[PDB]
Amino acid sequence: MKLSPREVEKLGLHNAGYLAQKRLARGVRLNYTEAVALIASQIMEYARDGEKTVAQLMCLGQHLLGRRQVLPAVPHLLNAVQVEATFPDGTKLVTVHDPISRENGELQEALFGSLLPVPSLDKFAENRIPGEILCEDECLTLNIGRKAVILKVTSKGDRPIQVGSHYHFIEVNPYLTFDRRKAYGMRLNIAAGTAVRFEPGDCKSVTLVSIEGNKVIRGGNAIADGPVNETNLEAAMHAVRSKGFGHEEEKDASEGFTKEDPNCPFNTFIHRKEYANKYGPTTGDKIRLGDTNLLAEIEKDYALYGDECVFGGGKVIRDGMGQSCGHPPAISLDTVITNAVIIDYTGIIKADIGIKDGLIASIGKAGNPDIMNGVFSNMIIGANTEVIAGEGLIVTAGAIDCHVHYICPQLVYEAISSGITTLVGGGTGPAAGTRATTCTPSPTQMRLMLQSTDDLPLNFGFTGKGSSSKPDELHEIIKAGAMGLKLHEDWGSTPAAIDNCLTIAEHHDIQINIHTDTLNEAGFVEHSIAAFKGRTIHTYHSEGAGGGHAPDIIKVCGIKNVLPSSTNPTRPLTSNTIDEHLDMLMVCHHLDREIPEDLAFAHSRIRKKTIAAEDVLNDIGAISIISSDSQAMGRVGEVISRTWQTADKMKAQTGPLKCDSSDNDNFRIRRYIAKYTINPAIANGFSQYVGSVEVGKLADLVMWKPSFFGTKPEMVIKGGMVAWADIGDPNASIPTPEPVKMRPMYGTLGKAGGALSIAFVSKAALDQRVNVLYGLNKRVEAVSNVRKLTKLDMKLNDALPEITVDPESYTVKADGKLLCVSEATTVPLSRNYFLF
């Protein structure tokens, strides 16, 4: 066949289309993903037939699926479908604009080439706008507090001339005629990144405003190079005359100032709706998170309206304009993320993000101090600065999953593609020990796992086997590179082992993670708590379905020296949770339903009442961390989604939190994002490096469309370089035609991944330079400051309720009050998004 990579890929796309066609044929209302697959595949198939033009297929594509054949959200989510195919005249791109335009599609066309029977329209049996922006109906004034002038501008050219918002107006094409003197030090008072067009012979009046900051003109035609002053004005006018740039005095041109005044003729206004469309939302605006019920309100914005950094043709980030000429090369940002909505435990804000040497260098207003006010010296865009366009998007910290079983490499790819940039756990591959426990037991394996993962663009921490009553071997795995230890009942979680392991932790400044004695073999939960002896410990899957003292391990959530986490599969309590978990446990542990003792054990471990309590305890901040339990009892690609599904369920069933305002869900949002960002970093002792969008930390950052927030990110940035991202057909004319998949980027090739990341180890390991011993390219840093932590150090998740669990009925109470929530029948961040 001699198949090229693109032919293999397009076959995959066609297969997805055919799946969507079969589903359509039985009356399934297609989701966004299925709709894209079907429409793109159909365009390819009509191209193969060779009877239809690109123009014809732009039209035909709008007739395939109607509103009745797709889910309610699809007409909102689906703005366009793009694909390239081999026409009789070669490869061409087709864009189908707004494809869901009718009530019912022409289903013979939707099923063309499939040989499937066309279903009657009555087969499709009978709302929320994902990622919607809410704003007040009001306009905003641009460029306030500046000198202004209105000038008549005439084109004497025979070809069109277009001038951008931040172009120095005296520097324009000599075939424009106007008062060049009055234009000196001025620029167009129009929305940032827009332009004014002059056709040959056109006269148009334009409003100009003064440049600000240092007021220095650079670039263009070098007519008026230098600081704005009287001497340089006269020099500029001499150059205008000598070089024949169009100039005519306009003595009576209106002059004034811009201000907060709806009636000022010098002002330019923009409605909040259009502002949000161009730059993303601003202060007071609200954003729906994915298809959840959660609304995030912008708390503050660093932008000065009119000076937004937007990159593109005729736009702001250009030489001498938004791109600075007046600064030392060494202080140029490496990359700027422009116009980001930042969602972080520290706040929900609007800002530019500066990246330098792989670190978050600055958060605030970026640009050029020579023409803009409010640009600090650490936010300068230079010639040597890359641009990532954040407008309309949400940026968060990379997620940190701190309950990883390293069972296979493929879970790493699933993790990063979901928005996780740090993994903490243990394992050696799919050995029984690892399939059961987060343990890398041997120094040999510690070396090999650090070497194995050295080129992967994630930060890694490996934990050894802490289940020993003697310190001797624990010292060895720690000096070999372990940054923590796991106590697991499968290796013995006895009071003797617990005490020894914690004594080791006190010496080594590492965190201990525990899966307790489910069997109550050596003691009940109170006896394990006693063995902690008030020392800091991280309790894994604190609810207990994932393991622990039956039935009351969840009591640890009220213990001050405990840092409690949840694993994912129980998040949140839904219709299928109990049936799924009970069978999973009995299959995994080879338990027989016919044997009374086996069933008794299973029922003692899988409990509706404690899982329901876990929903509430997460919501009130009594559980501090959410994690996967990857391929042992949890799902690596669902750390983020399960967190937001829990928050959504709790809002639906209890309303806003005590500390939330009436207008938004900001407090709940900040509390929940802390669970998979900052708190895993604090618990494990590397919070100075990662875990939040804050200056000085690694630029591990994830870009989200609001409509896909919490499910499928756009782009994963690791140490300031794109590591993974959505990209379409590699042969295509543009990056967006189908099939669009999450794919590894340049941060995954060669040794680039190591340059962008950190392997976290113990101080003991770093003291012996384990990176040198093992020949690692990845930076290594020691974990620290984990032995004086309490629940109070868990950001926004510091609650310590007195927890009681009835030993017979399993009823859970917090401070004497019943902790109960109903099962949810549905969750968001699911059916709208996934192909399977």
Q: Name the strand (E) or helix (H) holding 435.
A: helix 432-436
What's the 3-state SS for 491-533?
HCCCHHHHHHHHHHHHHHCCEEEEECCCCCCCCCHHHHHHHHC
User: Does the protein bind Ni ion through residue 465 (CB under 5 A)?
Assistant: no
User: Does the protein bind Ni ion through residue 486 (CB under 5 A)?
Assistant: no
Query: Choosing among its own copies, Ni ion, none, which partner's interface includes residue 550 (Cβ < 5 to 8 Å by kind)?
Result: its own copies
Q: Scan residues 763-782 and list those touching its own copies (CB under 8 A).
A: 775
User: Does the protein bind its own copies through residue 614 (CB under 8 A)?
Assistant: no
User: Does the protein bind Ni ion through residue 425 (CB under 5 A)?
Assistant: no
Measured from the CB atom, the residue of 555 and 668 that comes closer to its own copies is 555
Measured from the CB atom, the residue of 406 and 644 that comes closer to Ni ion is 406
Do β-strands 347-356 and 300-301 pair in parallel, antiparallel, or remain unpaired?
Answer: parallel
- The site that binds its own copies (CB under 8 A) totals a number of residues, namely 243
- 590 marked ligand binding residue: no
φ/ψ region of 695 (left if φ > 0, alpha if ψ in -120 to 50, else beta) reads: beta
Q: With CA atoms as reference, report the closest residue to 224 among 150, 283, 271, 168.
A: 168
User: Does the protein bind Ni ion through residue 629 (CB under 5 A)?
Assistant: yes
- 488 marked ligand binding residue: yes
Minimal distance in Å, beta carbon 658 to its own copies?
28
Q: Which range touches its own copies (CB under 8 A), out of 294-302, 558-566, 585-593, 783-791? A: 585-593
User: Please, what is the Cα angle at 234 between 233 and 239, to 5 degrees?
Assistant: 95
User: Does the protein bind its own copies through residue 205 (CB under 8 A)?
Assistant: no
Q: Scan residues 506-545 and list those touching Ni ion (CB under 5 A).
A: 515
Q: With CA atoms as reference, report the closest residue to 380 among 342, 398, 354.
A: 354
- 649 marked ligand binding residue: no
Query: Choosing among its own copies, Ni ion, none, which partner's interface includes residue 726 (Cβ < 5 to 8 Å by kind)?
Result: its own copies
At 665 the three-state DSSP class reads: coil
- 247 marked ligand binding residue: no
Q: Which range touches its own copies (CB under 8 A), out of 195-203, 228-236, 366-374, 686-694? A: 195-203
Q: Cα-flanking dihedrals φ and ψ of residue 208, to 5°?
A: -115, 145
What's the 3-state SS for 740-762?
CEEEECHHHCCCHHHHCCEEEEC
Query: Is the distance from CB of 602 to CB of 574 less than 8 angstroms?
Result: no
Query: Choosing among Ni ion, its own copies, none, which partner's interface includes residue 202 (Cβ < 5 to 8 Å by kind)?
Result: none
Q: Scan residues 497-516 and list those touching its own copies (CB under 8 A).
A: 497
Q: Which residues are catalytically annotated?
A: 589
Candidates 377, 575, 654, 822: give the one binding its own copies (CB under 8 A).
Answer: 575
Minimal distance in Å, beta carbon 150 to its own copies?
20
User: Does the protein bind Ni ion through residue 632 (CB under 5 A)?
Assistant: yes
Q: Scan residues 536-555 and list those touching its own copies (CB under 8 A).
A: 549-552
Query: Choosing among Ni ion, its own copies, none, which partner's interface includes residue 1 (Cβ < 5 to 8 Å by kind)?
Result: its own copies
- For 200, other C-beta atoms within 10 Å of its C-beta total 12
User: Does the protein bind Ni ion through residue 552 (CB under 5 A)?
Assistant: no
User: Does the protein bind its own copies through residue 618 (CB under 8 A)?
Assistant: no
Breaks, C-N > 2.5 A, in the chain lie after 126
User: Does the protein bind its own copies through residue 496 (CB under 8 A)?
Assistant: yes
Site string (424-463) toward its own copies, x via CB under 8 A: ----xxxxxxxxx--x-xxxxx--xx-xxxxxx-------
272-to-165, 305, 705 alpha-carbon distances in Å: 19, 11, 19
Measured from the CB atom, the residue of 527 and 608 that comes closer to its own copies is 527
Residue 670 C-alpha from the chain's centroid:
14
Measured from the CB atom, the residue of 225 and 629 that comes closer to Ni ion is 629
Q: Rounded to 10 degrees, what is the CA torsion of 676, 680, 682, 685?
A: -150
User: Does the protein bind its own copies through residue 470 (CB under 8 A)?
Assistant: yes
Query: Choosing among its own copies, Ni ion, none, which partner's interface includes residue 443 (Cβ < 5 to 8 Å by kind)?
Result: its own copies
Site string (345-374) toward its own copies, x via CB under 8 A: -----------xxx----------------
Q: With CA atoms as reference, report the closest residue to 47 among 83, 13, 96.
A: 83
User: Does the protein bind its own copies through residue 211 (CB under 8 A)?
Assistant: no
Candidates 95, 154, 232, 373: give the one binding its own copies (CB under 8 A).
Answer: 95
Alpha-carbon distance of 97 to 804, in angstroms, equals 58
Query: Choosing among its own copies, Ni ion, none, which partner's interface includes residue 701 (Cβ < 5 to 8 Å by kind)?
Result: none
Minimal distance in Å, beta carbon 792 to its own copies?
30
Residue type, 585: L
Q: Which range touches its own copies (CB under 8 A), out of 204-212, 234-242, 283-291, 572-580? A: 572-580
Q: Scan residues 365-394 and list those touching Ni ion (CB under 5 A).
A: none
- 403 marked ligand binding residue: yes
- 541 marked ligand binding residue: yes
* DSSP secondary structure code for residue 310 in this structure: -
* DSSP secondary structure code for residue 574 in this structure: B
Alpha-carbon distance of 435 to 428, in angstroms, equals 9
Q: Rounded to 10 degrees, what is the CA torsion of 714, 720, 724, 729?
A: 70
Q: Cα-flanking dihedrals φ and ψ of residue 319, to 5°?
A: -45, 120
Query: Is the distance from CB of 206 to CB of 155 less than 8 angstroms?
Result: no
Measured from the CB atom, the residue of 55 and 792 that comes closer to its own copies is 55
Q: Which range touches its own copies (CB under 8 A), out of 300-308, 341-349, 523-531, 613-621? A: 523-531
Residue 812 C-alpha from the chain's centroid:
35
Q: How would you label 533-570 residue by residue, b for 16+ Cβ within 10 Å and e otherwise?
A: eebbbbbbbbbbbbbbbbbbbbbbbbbeebbbbbbbbb
Q: Scan residues 797-826 and list those touching its own copies (CB under 8 A).
A: 807-808, 824-826
Q: Residue 387 burial (CB < 10 Å; 0-12/13-18/19+)?
A: buried
Enumerate the known binding-site residues: 403, 405, 486, 488, 515, 541, 629
List of residues contacting Ni ion (CB under 5 A) = 515, 546-547, 629, 632
Enumerate the known binding-site residues for Ni(2+): 403, 405, 486, 515, 541, 629
Enumerate the known binding-site residues for substrate: 488
